[PDB]
Structures are given as structure tokens and as C-alpha cells.
Amino acid sequence: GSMKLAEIMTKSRKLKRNLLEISKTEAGQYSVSAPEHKGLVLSGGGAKGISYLGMIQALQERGKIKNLTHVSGASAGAMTASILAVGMDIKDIKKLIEGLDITKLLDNSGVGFRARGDRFRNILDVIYMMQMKKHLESVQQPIPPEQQMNYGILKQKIALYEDKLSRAGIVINNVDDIINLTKSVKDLEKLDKALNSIPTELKGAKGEQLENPRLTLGDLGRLRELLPEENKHLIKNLSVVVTNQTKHELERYSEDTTPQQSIAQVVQWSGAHPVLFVPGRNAKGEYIADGGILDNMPEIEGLDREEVLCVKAEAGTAFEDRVNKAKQSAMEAISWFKARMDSLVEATIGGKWLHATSSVLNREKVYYNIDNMIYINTGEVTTTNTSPTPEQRARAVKNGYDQTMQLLDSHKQTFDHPLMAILYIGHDKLKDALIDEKSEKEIFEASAHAQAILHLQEQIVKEMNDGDYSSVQNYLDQIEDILTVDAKMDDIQKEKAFALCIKQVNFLSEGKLETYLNKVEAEAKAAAEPSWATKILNLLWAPIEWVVSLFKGPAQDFKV
């Protein structure tokens, strides 16, 4: 990860990041997996946050959560995000999301038929308190360095909260206590009166700013520090996006920038949708609203796209399943290969036809790429919600669960021959790869050839752009020679790799190669003679899924 400040230098000196993970299977193969996921971004969308439950379950089962360091979100995303961040556990997170009387979450204390937002913010505080209190007690006896000052502040805040709730006759020791509280409206009113009594800010003698009475973003840091090493991961670094109505742009609140901001206050603001709530208002007097109504979620600063999962839920069924989108493309790819093959009589000998363009397939992934975008169809669950249809809910949930699983699966790819893996990744992204031990040997032997090949690919492009095609064939034959002799690849493997290389050159040249090939074949047809170009083209149209598969059969027999 690189901070935007590093871009201010005249001569940047790229640091080493990790975007890939090459490993060697017990099977003896090589697998290209994405790097461990560090950040999670939950896009806004209103009450479609019931789905996030499914998405979390997926990450849970797959053990992806534990290695998260950052969590950012807006609207429903923001809440979910904060519950994750505050180190709550799935069991309870699940119990919360599905169990909160969001219907009674919308106070009437508002005006003009809109909630004031104070109640929602109050339930959040009760939650953060309850969960942070449990962690606070997970700390050991010592408590030495400035960890004595932090421990005190937290202990005191939790103290303040309880004194206020006790007097109110409210007692919360766990998730259920909270959920039950939301069901009683008389109790909810006691909550508001109780917690609303706590001031927004506290200034001192000379009007200096004092510690926020409420649990803040910064307290998450205070808590993380105090905890034992093996438990520090439980608490995440939370970012909350919001729309600053006054400045009319989004504003992000986080533990590293606005550590003195109330967790509950920010999350409530992030969900202060203009349709359901009256705008919020910060200390500066600027008006705040739902973080998802003006623009999309900004990325987490210190991380790389490759390390961050972005979940974005939307109403209706605008999006299509991932697996059914893969097989739809795969089928089209195979269809195109067939189209090229079945057209050989007209293409080479004679007939009335005209070839299409790889441009009707330029939506082909020629290099390894990680897609970290999780799209979820929420169905009939839109921003405005009053319908907890036992169905529409269970559908949106598992619908979100499946999506996380699908995208999570599209990450790992497995190749048979290390040269293949490396050629797909590209010598470029090879340096930003986290290579394994058992792999290092063959990988670097293979990268040597990969470089020799790359140089040739590059040269072909270079020479064509200068309008010199005299050596295109020769260079191509050379690349094949390297794959056969130097790399020693089976006939099938070689065929697949060479196919890939041909494709990558076409890409790098922006179809300048394919045009040449087609022209050569065409002239050859006119001369009533064969052409070396035909073989290369048949390889160009090979189906990419095959090129990457471990089929062990030629493109022709690839079914799927």
C-alpha cells in the first residue's frame, strides 16, 4: 500500500507490495491466489444491509475476516462495518442484524414525518458499549505504560453509560438484552431520555476541547492497544463515509483522522437518508446525511485494490449471478473458436465470407486479474423499508452469501507448468508477487524464459508500430521454440502457452497483429497456397478458458 503523499516526489521509488500469491500444491502444481484480504468496503444503499449478513457468513466460513485490518462503510454498510470493527462475533452479529426492530428504530421525535435520528444513534451506543465492555475485561492484570491512561478513559466511559442506563432501569449484558429493548416502546423512550442527557461536546475552563463523553472512533485504538497480541485483530480500524450536505460532497470519518468522533453519531449520520431522517448536524454546524446518496465509496488509503473486497448491494435484480456470467462468456468464447475453425475453407481456399475481430472478444482476460467487486441483488428490498418479508429477507441474505462465495472462488487459478503461470501473471506483476518457498526454484528458472519471451513479444509490437512486419513470423517461431526446447512443455501445454503469447501480443499491439495475420492469410488464399498465418490465427481464437484450463486435450475437444 502507498499513501498519496508518496506521489508528490519528483522521482518515485516503487515499494514492494503484494498483489499475488504463487504457491505449490501437494499435487505438485502451481496456484495463483489473491493476497490475503486486508480491507472490506461496504457500499451504501439504504436498508439493503440485511444482505450483508450473508456476505459476512461467507467471509466467516472462509476465514477471511480475521485478517482484516480495515473496515469502511456507508449507510447500512456503515452500521454493519462498525459492528464488525468493534470486534463483535458472527453469532451475535447475525442475531443483531435480523432482530432489530428497525421499524421502531425510526423515532417520531422528528419533524415533517422524519425521524430525528437520536434513537437510532442511542441503540448503536448501547451496542458499542456492551461489546466494548466485554473486550475491556479481556485485558490482563498488568496494564502498564500509558495503557493505564487509556484503560481508565474507557472504564470511565462505560461507567458513564451504565450509570445513565441504570437510573433508567435499563440493563444490557448481551445482544438479546438489546434486541428485547428495541421491542418495548416505553423502554426505548427511557433510553432516549437517559442517553440524550449526555452532552455532545465537553469544553473546559478556557474552552479547550475535552474527551468526548461517548465511545469514539479513537477509543477503538485505545482498546486495540490494551488487548493481548493474539486478540488485537478482533478490533478493526473503522472508516465511515457520510454526505456533507452543506459542502455538498462526502466526508470520511475515521480512527486516524477524526479519533474524537462518536462511533454512534457517525454511523447514524451515515444512514441519515433524506427520505427517513432529518439531516444531522456537526459541531461546525454543517448538515450531514446518508453517505450513499451522493457518490460511491472512496477506497481505503493505505491499501491496494487487490487487498480490498468491495461489497455493493443494489435493489431489483440488475446484476446477474457470477457463475452464470462466467459460463455465458465461456460459451461465447468456445462459439468463436468454432466460428474460426468452421470457416477455414472460405478463409484459406475459397469462399464468400469475411472474418470478425478479436474485438468481438476483446473482453477476454489475457493476463491474471483479481476481481474484488462483490455485487448483490437485494430484490424488492429498497432504501425505504417496512417489509421484513420472511422470504425477501432470507433471499437477500443467502443471495449475498452466494455472491461472496463465487467471487471468492474466482480468485485462485491453478496451472500445471510454472512458465504458464508466470506468463499469465506477466513479468511485470511478478515482482509484486509473494512467492512461496517450494516454488522459488522453478519459478525463477521459469521467469528467465518468461523474460526472453517477453522481450520478443515486446519486440514484435515495437517493430510493427514502426511499420516493420518482416520479422513477425520469425519472432513468433522463436517464442514457440523457447516454449518447446527451453521450457520443455508437453505438446498440449506448449500449444496453450503459445496461444496465450500470441493473444498477449495482439493485445499489446491493439489488434495490429491480427490485422497483419488476416491480411497474410488473405494474400495466401489469393495465391492458392497455404500460410503459416493460419496456424497462428487458429491459436489466436483459441478459447481463453481452455488456454488457462488443465484440460489436457486440444481446443477442439474443449467442451465445458
Add this chain to the structure above:
Amino acid sequence: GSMKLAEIMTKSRKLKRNLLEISKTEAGQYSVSAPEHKGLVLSGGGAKGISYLGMIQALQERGKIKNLTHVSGASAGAMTASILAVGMDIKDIKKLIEGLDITKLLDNSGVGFRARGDRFRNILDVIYMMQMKKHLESVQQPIPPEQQMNYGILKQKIALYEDKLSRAGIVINNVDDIINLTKSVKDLEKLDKALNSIPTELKGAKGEQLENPRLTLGDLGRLRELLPEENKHLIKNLSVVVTNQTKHELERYSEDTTPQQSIAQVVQWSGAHPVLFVPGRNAKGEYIADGGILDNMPEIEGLDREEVLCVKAEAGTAFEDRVNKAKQSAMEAISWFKARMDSLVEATIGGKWLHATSSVLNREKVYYNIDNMIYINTGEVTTTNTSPTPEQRARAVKNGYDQTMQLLDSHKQTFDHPLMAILYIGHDKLKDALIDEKSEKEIFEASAHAQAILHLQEQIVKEMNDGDYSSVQNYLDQIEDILTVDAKMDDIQKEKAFALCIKQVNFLSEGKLETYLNKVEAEAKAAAEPSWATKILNLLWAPIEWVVSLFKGPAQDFKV
């Protein structure tokens, strides 16, 4: 330490703090020392910060610095404060303060005959960078948890700074490199151009706030975390007070509230005196100026007055030495005892006179008290400075050194008998005391009697306020009985303790006792008879220094 948020509860439940430190000497005595000093507050005053050098030397020799967790300051104080905070070492801190061409620190880039402030802020950045870079390299090889993200950000900032300075042909590896830089004006101009090129803020795609390119208050946290335990104390938690000209009140910037604030920018602002600099301006567009021109320094939030040293320098010689102020009072105290004794013929038998009041000595410390206020006379060194008189400088320095030493000495007191110590401290502040091991036995035996005595003191007051003096004598005799029999104190010790008790009762009763005594003596004189009141009064006027001394002779022979 208690946060002001804990004051919001209906029923506060006082936490245990530490304001005292009872220990047992090898001599076999008991000493009442102040608690370890946690915070240091350096009041504003303009360029009188040359004196702070002396004050630091004192703390250094006395090992008081190492246990500091917080450092707060304004104006000259702010700079000094930040250099301390950034873990710099005395040797260099000394070399810096005295060696900076503050004369050439005041750029001409300003307007209306005032510095713009950009240069001063630039030298500060060069300093923070240089010192933080050294610490950054003190970190070990591992760097594991989110300590990888921090380490990166710092490494990058330092990187940015150097790239800018290198291009400028500037190289700083130590304090001297910096000092020398300040001597060349052509070099200083290169610095400004170089560092001024770095933007104030950096916003992203959607206008989200991004990491400050400059070293921030928050980076101090980043650095502290990264360092090895035994070295975490090197880096202090910095607060910087400033005057917000626009809002016309002071504003405090700190690592826990405004972690994203530039250290250099804040310190420069804190010293942006209206006479020498044009006002500063923050992101909100509010105007900023010297933190010491509008009001005094506010206290560090989580700490107790008892744990914080406050240094406040002022021009001229308004203040008087501490030792010469003690002996001046001591002499007056002894003089008063003499006045009471030499007046006994008139007081008891007959003569024309009229007694003064303990109110001419109510400036007498009846209970143990810690004075943490260090006052320094800066002499002819005022806010506006152009006079680095080799003298006036050395005078202000050592003048500040002596003061820290004096006040630092007035802290420890040593008593012979544990009951004495406890009676001076007061059963009240006894609970907030950090008692030692070897002491616990006798202390709690002694506190039992102390309580019995307190109850009696209290009772005397209680009964007098209800206009009942019938048992004043009896109660007093009882207290003496407890000191003689129960505590078993030498005649001298007993006399001293009883004196103290009599005084404390007078205080608690607001001279209601002394009035009674005097009246009793007066009536007794009229009846031509002696009075028990005379003894008590002679004890009331005993000199407090004696009462607390280990003289081992009666008040009469106390010289000093």
C-alpha cells in the same frame, strides 16, 4: 487522573489516584514525597524560551523527564515541548535552543514588517524529520501487526522530506547540520522553496481527506507504537495551545484530538506572535496566533495537578527566588511566635496590649501541600527579541535551572514519627497516597490514632459552630492524651504534633477557636488567675517550620 466526562454521573465513585508517596528511609524515618511527575506544561511568553533550557537540565539531572507521558506548551513553550516530545536528547536539545539563528528565523517573506512564518515552520519540519528518522531506525527487524502500515507511512513521509531537500542540495543528518543551515540565508531560501512545495492538505478522488504529507501529531503515536517497550517513553504525548483569533479563544491541538495536524504547523502557529508574525490560517479559514497572548495554559486532561509541573516564565524580575521566599516567611513565623511569648505578662497578668490574629499568619500551610508551579524571571529578555546577550542568556538559563531545582526540593519532607506524617497529610489525602512496603505496618497503626484524633478535631469544630464551647478543653486534652499515651511520642514530638492539631482545628473552624482561647485567657487575666488557654495559644503561635522540622528542641530555641 479523572476525565471531565466522569463528572456527568449523578453519583460519582471516586477512583484511586496517587498524590503522595510515603516511604521509609534507611535512616528509619518517614518521607512524604510528591508522586512521580507525569505531565509538563510550558506556558507561553514569547522568546523567553531560552530559559526553558535550564529548566530541562534540572529535570534531566533529577531524572524527572523519563517518566513524563505528556508535554503541553504554547509559544516558546510549544517548540521546546515538541522537541522534548519527539524524543530528542538533552545534549542536542541544548545545542539547538542556543544555536538557532532566530534572528534569521524571522523571514522577510511576510508583509507589513512581519514574518510570514513559513520559514520557522520549515526549520521545525527539518528537525522533527531528522529526529524521528533516527528513532525510526531504532525499530527491530520484525514489524508485524498493523505496525507494518504505520512503519510504511512514516518511512514514506521521511522519504518525501529528503527527496525535497536533496533536490535542494540540502542535507541534514544531525543537529549541527540544521544549525549550520540556519546561518546561511541562501540556504534558508532553498529550504523554503523546497518544503513550501509540499501541499497543506491532500484530497482524493471524491474529495475524501487524505494523510497529511507532513509529520503530524498522530505520527508521534505511530512512532511510539513501533518502538521497543523500553524505548516507548522517549516519545511523549504532545499538546500545543494556540490562540484562535477568529473565535477569539484558545484552541488546543493534540495527538488524541487532532492527530492529523502538522507538528511544525502547530508549533509555528503557537509562536505566531502578532508583533513578529502575520496571523496563521487553518483549513477552516480561521485565523491563528500565539497561544500565550490571550489566556493562560489549560491543564492536561487525564492528569492531577499533583502530577504536573507548570513552568511559567515572565519578563523582568517580578518573581522572587523560592529559597529566599521560604526564609522570609520562616523568619516572619518565628517573629510571631516571639511576639506571642514576649507578650505574656500583658496577656496573662496585666498590661496594656491587644493580640494580633493567626490571620496575620493564615498564609501558613497547615496540611501537606505540593506546589508544582515553577516561576522563572527572564530578566530583560521579553517577547520581542534581537538581543542574544551572552549574559542575559546565561542568566535566564541558569536562573531557570535554579528554580526547577528549588521547587523540586520543596516537595520532599521527612518526619520522625509516622503519626506526625499522617496528621500533616490528613486522613483525607491518606487514601490517595501511594504507601510503601516497609511503611504499611506502622502507617496503618498510626492512621488508627490519626482517625481517633480527626474525629475529635471535627467534633470540636462541630460543637463550636453550634455555639457550644463547653467541651473544647476536654477534647483538646484528649487529643494530647492520644498523642502521649496511645502514640507514645517524645515530649518534643508530642508538643509538635499537638501544636499542629491545635492549628488544624483553628483552620477548620476559621479562627473560631483562637477567638475562644483569647477570650478565655482574657477573662482569666481579669480574675487574676492562670488559664489552660495560655498553653494552647502558645502552641497555636508555634512556628510552623518548627512544627514540621526535626529540630529536637522546643519552639523557643528554634533559630534557622
